Design a protein around this ligand. Sequence first.
Ligand SMILES: COCC(CCO[C@H]1CC[C@@]2(C)C(=CC[C@H]3[C@@H]4C[C@@H]5O[C@]6(CC[C@@H](C)CO6)[C@@H](C)[C@@H]5[C@@]4(C)CC[C@@H]32)C1)COC
Ligand SMILES: COCC(CCO[C@H]1CC[C@@]2(C)C(=CC[C@H]3[C@@H]4C[C@@H]5O[C@]6(CC[C@@H](C)CO6)[C@@H](C)[C@@H]5[C@@]4(C)CC[C@@H]32)C1)COC
Ligand SMILES: COCC(CCO[C@H]1CC[C@@]2(C)C(=CC[C@H]3[C@@H]4C[C@@H]5O[C@]6(CC[C@@H](C)CO6)[C@@H](C)[C@@H]5[C@@]4(C)CC[C@@H]32)C1)COC
Ligand SMILES: CC(C)CCC[C@@H](C)[C@H]1CC[C@H]2[C@@H]3CC=C4C[C@@H](O)CC[C@]4(C)[C@H]3CC[C@]12C
Ligand SMILES: CC(C)CCC[C@@H](C)[C@H]1CC[C@H]2[C@@H]3CC=C4C[C@@H](O)CC[C@]4(C)[C@H]3CC[C@]12C
Ligand SMILES: CC(C)CCC[C@@H](C)[C@H]1CC[C@H]2[C@@H]3CC=C4C[C@@H](O)CC[C@]4(C)[C@H]3CC[C@]12C
Ligand SMILES: N[C@@H](CC(=O)Nc1ccc(Oc2cc(F)c(F)cc2Br)cc1)C(=O)O
Ligand SMILES: N[C@@H](CC(=O)Nc1ccc(Oc2cc(F)c(F)cc2Br)cc1)C(=O)O
Ligand SMILES: N[C@@H](CC(=O)Nc1ccc(Oc2cc(F)c(F)cc2Br)cc1)C(=O)O
Lengths: 402, 402, 402
Amino acid sequence: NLLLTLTVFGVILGAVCGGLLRLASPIHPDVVMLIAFPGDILMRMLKMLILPLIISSLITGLSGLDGRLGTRAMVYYMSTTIIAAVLGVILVLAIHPGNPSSLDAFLDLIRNLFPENLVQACFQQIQTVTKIKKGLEFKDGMNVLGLIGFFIAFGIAMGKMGDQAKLMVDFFNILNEIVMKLVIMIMWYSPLGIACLICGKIIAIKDLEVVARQLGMYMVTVIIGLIIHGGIFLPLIYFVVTRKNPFSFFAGIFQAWITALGTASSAGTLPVTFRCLEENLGIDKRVTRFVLPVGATINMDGTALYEAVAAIFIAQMNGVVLDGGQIVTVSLTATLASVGAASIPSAGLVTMLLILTAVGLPTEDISLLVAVDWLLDRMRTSVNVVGDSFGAGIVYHLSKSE
Amino acid sequence: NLLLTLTVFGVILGAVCGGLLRLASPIHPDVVMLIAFPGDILMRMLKMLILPLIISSLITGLSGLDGRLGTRAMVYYMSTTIIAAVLGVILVLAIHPGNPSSLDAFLDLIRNLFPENLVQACFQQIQTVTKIKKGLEFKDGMNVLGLIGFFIAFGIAMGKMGDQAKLMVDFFNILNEIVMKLVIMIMWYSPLGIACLICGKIIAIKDLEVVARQLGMYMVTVIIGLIIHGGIFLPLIYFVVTRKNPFSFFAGIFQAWITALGTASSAGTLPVTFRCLEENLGIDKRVTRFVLPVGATINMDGTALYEAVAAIFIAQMNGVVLDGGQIVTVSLTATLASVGAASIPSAGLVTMLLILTAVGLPTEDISLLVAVDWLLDRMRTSVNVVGDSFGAGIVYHLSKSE
Amino acid sequence: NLLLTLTVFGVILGAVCGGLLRLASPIHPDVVMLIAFPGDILMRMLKMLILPLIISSLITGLSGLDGRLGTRAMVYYMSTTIIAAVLGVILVLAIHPGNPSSLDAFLDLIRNLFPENLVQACFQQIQTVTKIKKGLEFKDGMNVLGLIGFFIAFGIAMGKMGDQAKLMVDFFNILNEIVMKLVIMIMWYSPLGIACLICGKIIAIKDLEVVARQLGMYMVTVIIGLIIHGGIFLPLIYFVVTRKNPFSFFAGIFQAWITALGTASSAGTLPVTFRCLEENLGIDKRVTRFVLPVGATINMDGTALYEAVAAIFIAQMNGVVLDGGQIVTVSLTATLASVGAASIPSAGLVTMLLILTAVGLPTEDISLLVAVDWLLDRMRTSVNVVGDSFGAGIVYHLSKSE
Ligand SMILES: COCC(CCO[C@H]1CC[C@@]2(C)C(=CC[C@H]3[C@@H]4C[C@@H]5O[C@]6(CC[C@@H](C)CO6)[C@@H](C)[C@@H]5[C@@]4(C)CC[C@@H]32)C1)COC
Ligand SMILES: COCC(CCO[C@H]1CC[C@@]2(C)C(=CC[C@H]3[C@@H]4C[C@@H]5O[C@]6(CC[C@@H](C)CO6)[C@@H](C)[C@@H]5[C@@]4(C)CC[C@@H]32)C1)COC
Ligand SMILES: COCC(CCO[C@H]1CC[C@@]2(C)C(=CC[C@H]3[C@@H]4C[C@@H]5O[C@]6(CC[C@@H](C)CO6)[C@@H](C)[C@@H]5[C@@]4(C)CC[C@@H]32)C1)COC
Ligand SMILES: CC(C)CCC[C@@H](C)[C@H]1CC[C@H]2[C@@H]3CC=C4C[C@@H](O)CC[C@]4(C)[C@H]3CC[C@]12C
Ligand SMILES: CC(C)CCC[C@@H](C)[C@H]1CC[C@H]2[C@@H]3CC=C4C[C@@H](O)CC[C@]4(C)[C@H]3CC[C@]12C
Ligand SMILES: CC(C)CCC[C@@H](C)[C@H]1CC[C@H]2[C@@H]3CC=C4C[C@@H](O)CC[C@]4(C)[C@H]3CC[C@]12C
Ligand SMILES: N[C@@H](CC(=O)Nc1ccc(Oc2cc(F)c(F)cc2Br)cc1)C(=O)O
Ligand SMILES: N[C@@H](CC(=O)Nc1ccc(Oc2cc(F)c(F)cc2Br)cc1)C(=O)O
Ligand SMILES: N[C@@H](CC(=O)Nc1ccc(Oc2cc(F)c(F)cc2Br)cc1)C(=O)O
């Protein structure tokens, strides 16, 4: 993509400009603030779209776009995505690629799933505080999970209204279409905004090597998880359900997996993977035709794991320990954000800010992730496809009732 | 109703489980927090629906569903309901069944009726503070009266637009339908959530007998008010307008009043009370046919008085003295909440939380009211019907212009 | 207008009642609070409409009502209006008719143009704070510019959807129609509310003469700016673009300029000014017919300058120095508020409260401006027309491509 080319030029232009300035001389903090500042505007403009995206997206999906295969598929996609998100979380916490009550954390999480007030859910979340007399208190930070939960119920209830709700469905489609023209417009300013964030990050850092390590270990963590998720869990889950040889199964899809690494798009890989399951594995076109193109938008195991790893890496870098509820929010938002980084065009960065905002994390560090994203995007696209493929397998085998 | 059977099983299951635990041994506060916790989820899920109910409900009612008899009826219903709400307030403050600046309180109330900002009205209300230099300051708590006032004006203005506003009417019907499917879904979780609140209330209390007294005196206060409201004020207002014998009037409707106590529903009592006024009193079918079925949704004198008593009883129990504005908010929200506990199905508990939230009261004590509600519901249903009946009377007499 | 007659009776009735009380004896502060109080209700009821007006207005305008002449006109109107707003600001700060970090002020402004959160933009704005460790912190005050920017993008994006967005256009027309029936209803209570504000202002003031001076100097500042804007800048911009004799140009429109001063309405002046440019200047009906009636709603150079002067005069009176960003907010809100004081009927006062709220200024001083507004309204209506007229000129000359 031009935007993909522009964003990487952008990273370079900003990396080089960042060193030139860093090696040039100490940059007065008000001059770094300014070099960064257009990049802060980019984060502000994306964060501004999170709320209207969540509401538009949820309502349009759960109503507008709602058999046995369907449940089989949907149950598969969601299970695998949460597995990848949790694996992400487990792995990032174990390897810990970053260097700078428990019950309450869980009850605050459950509390925040049911916000007393929707406008207040939009910009504030509940917390427990110790006075040893405990109290609930508000804290700044959009209650994302609470809002999502409300809008899932809202959105399912609207489906259960059928055409009686068609005017409300239509209203929220238009809102989605608009809000998506804006996430596209803003993403055109993204290369310059990324440039400025990076340029501003290099100049601030005390020791490039510490950050090169930390970011390197961040890349090893994502590839570990994609390897575990792609190479063990998904095949293992196929064998456990199909009692079939997964090594046989891979043999068929290898054309697709090659295609995924090269294309870095599951949409471009789509016609290849139809062939690989229809011809080589011999999966019934019906089970394919449903599951492959649906899976190419909602199943993104690999994008789930990346987002979970990335979120805690940013947390860890900014010397934040996540409480048990934060780490559960990360798993649930990583899952959803995955589903929507794939469903919403050029929402990759929006969905990262969703995750960071949900856990109340400093957002400017997203710059280093944008920097290494281009290498990782081909590898997670591979795990993303392989998942969809195994699904075709697990659905067809579980669909011999027919 | 199954829900009515389930909620009372729920109260029992929780009362017994509450004693078993209370008599078992001292329960560590973090274990009571947990026993209660599913019940806090119920309050959170209902409070979350208050805002979308008020907006949906107001707009759908004042526009969608808007002669001489009509004004006669509507002026009667509203007057009697405010009388019952104030009687409630007077009675509860006099008998005071609970044991743990004035101008400013009124101006803060009037201020809060006109909120400077609607989003801020949704989660915050104005207050006067003494520094002797007075200031306005925000306080946490949804400005319910302000929001309602805005949405009455909004909703009347939309009616005065006619079909020019039909798309906005339709949009807010669908929203109402949805928001009502959710208040139904949540009310199915209500028995378990009530169980857990009660279970959690018994275990916390130091002296069961003090609370049995206080709750008992709460029941005597409601029956006093239903007696005064049903037995004196309504007949007196009939005689004052009709110069007719009220004791004669009761003679006719006694079949209905019996039916009300047994049925505990004004909807089931409805065909009986048509008969009693058409046949026995000989009220013109026209004046009946309008006033009886409309009154069976919006006239609930007895549900108004109960809600006013209940609100201040919770206030009093939680060692809160209500300022003159709080007590006026209670009368106005008790009035509205009455009208909507009757108009919105399974909204009884929602409408209680509306009243408690409007006055910023601890909500968990709603449990004891849910506990004694089943005895009181047959008695207030009686006063509720008798009111509608007298109305048929007062409208027919005031409608001899014809 | 009756409202115009009533508001001036109102000012008098309140001026006289204010003196009577002021000369009567010292009025206990709680009795002044009360004399003022109905006027505070008026400010509250208008401020409550700002948000739904901005959203309704922006969406209905930028979508519903969106050639070369059109760009020529629109580029002219907007340029001249910002010139008048800045002239307003320059003049009021120089003459300074009122008696009781820089970069950060600009970055806070730019930050506030891109609000991280829309609900939070609705009632809160970002600020820099010094700890010399700088931080961002929220402050109470609706982020008007941020909200407007979001709703311009939103509104343009919806236009670029065409009829695909017709249901969302229709929805936001109805909302506009409603919100405008309310700004009309409230403006009928305005004379009494103005009366009470004034009555309350006289009684509080220590020295009438200081305030008569300050308000007098406020009137000299507006007339200076209308003279500079009307008499120098607009003709100069005509000569610079048309190389034509402006003194000739005025000769034609003098019938209109007379009509403007007398009528105090650009709508009543409208048929006159068609004649003056079609007959005397000989401007092509086409260029007139587009530009004159459009300009009679959106070009209000003179109303822009007044609002800018008025805003800083209120700031200055309330011993507030505006930071560089505040003064830029004033110029941008003064521009917009101009456009909408003209487009929205009886929104003059709403649009003043928009400007004061945008800069977080005490609003009750709007009373003195309402008091002197009647003299100034004929003079700014004159500059308002002259601007539209010169535009017809500058568009026709720049439209000889044809
Ligand atoms: C015959 O075939 C039928 C098939 C059925 C499709 O069903 C839909 C079910 C809901 C689902 C999974 C769909 C699309 C977008 C999905 C959303 C993207 C958003 O992303 C998020 C997170 C990130 C935010 C920035 C935006 O919102 C979520 C809240 C939102 C989301 C995950 C909620 C659920 C949505 C598809 C049709 O498929 C085309
Ligand atoms: C020919 O017959 C005509 C007749 C006319 C009916 O007119 C309507 C007038 C408005 C009215 C009284 C009606 C129904 C719901 C009523 C609402 C319930 C809600 O309850 C509340 C409080 C509690 C909240 C939880 C929800 O909102 C109020 C704000 C809301 C409410 C009290 C606002 C006023 C509404 C009926 C038709 O009758 C079927
Ligand atoms: C063939 O002729 C075509 C012509 C085209 C008209 O185009 C429209 C373009 C948008 C524009 C300029 C129009 C009307 C209201 C204008 C709004 C008034 C509001 O005022 C504000 C500020 C004050 C607030 C209280 C309300 O909102 C702004 C945000 C809002 C505003 C300035 C946004 C822009 C709007 C006209 C038709 O003309 C009839
Ligand atoms: C401050 C901003 C506006 C200037 C930055 C310059 C670069 C990075 C940006 C700004 C706007 C961008 C353009 C906006 C939209 C499109 C349309 C699309 O079909 C192809 C790319 C293209 C043509 C973009 C190319 C890159 C671009 C020129
Ligand atoms: C935690 C929750 C889900 C479990 C609690 C168990 C009990 C109290 C609840 C949970 C869901 C409830 C069911 C949900 C909805 C309906 C449909 C209605 O037509 C009859 C009652 C019925 C069938 C309910 C009976 C009681 C029920 C089984
Ligand atoms: C507290 C308020 C209601 C009382 C104040 C009295 C005066 C100032 C106000 C209140 C309501 C106003 C009326 C409301 C609306 C209209 C309709 C319009 O076509 C002509 C003017 C007219 C008829 C107004 C005249 C002035 C008026 C009588
Ligand atoms: N290619 C896959 C789908 C895929 O990976 N989607 C995706 C794409 C971009 C993206 O953007 C990010 C995320 C960050 F966290 C970050 F810091 C920077 C950027 Br830029 C996030 C997710 C397939 O099609 O299978
Ligand atoms: N039956 C009448 C109408 C009637 O009484 N409606 C009604 C029903 C349930 C209800 O629920 C509550 C309220 C509480 F305050 C509480 F604590 C617990 C519960 Br549960 C409130 C009002 C008729 O039809 O005439
Ligand atoms: N007449 C012009 C248009 C015109 O001036 N519009 C306008 C009208 C009223 C108005 O009202 C205010 C403003 C204040 F700041 C104030 F304090 C009090 C009041 Br009241 C503001 C702007 C034309 O038609 O050309």
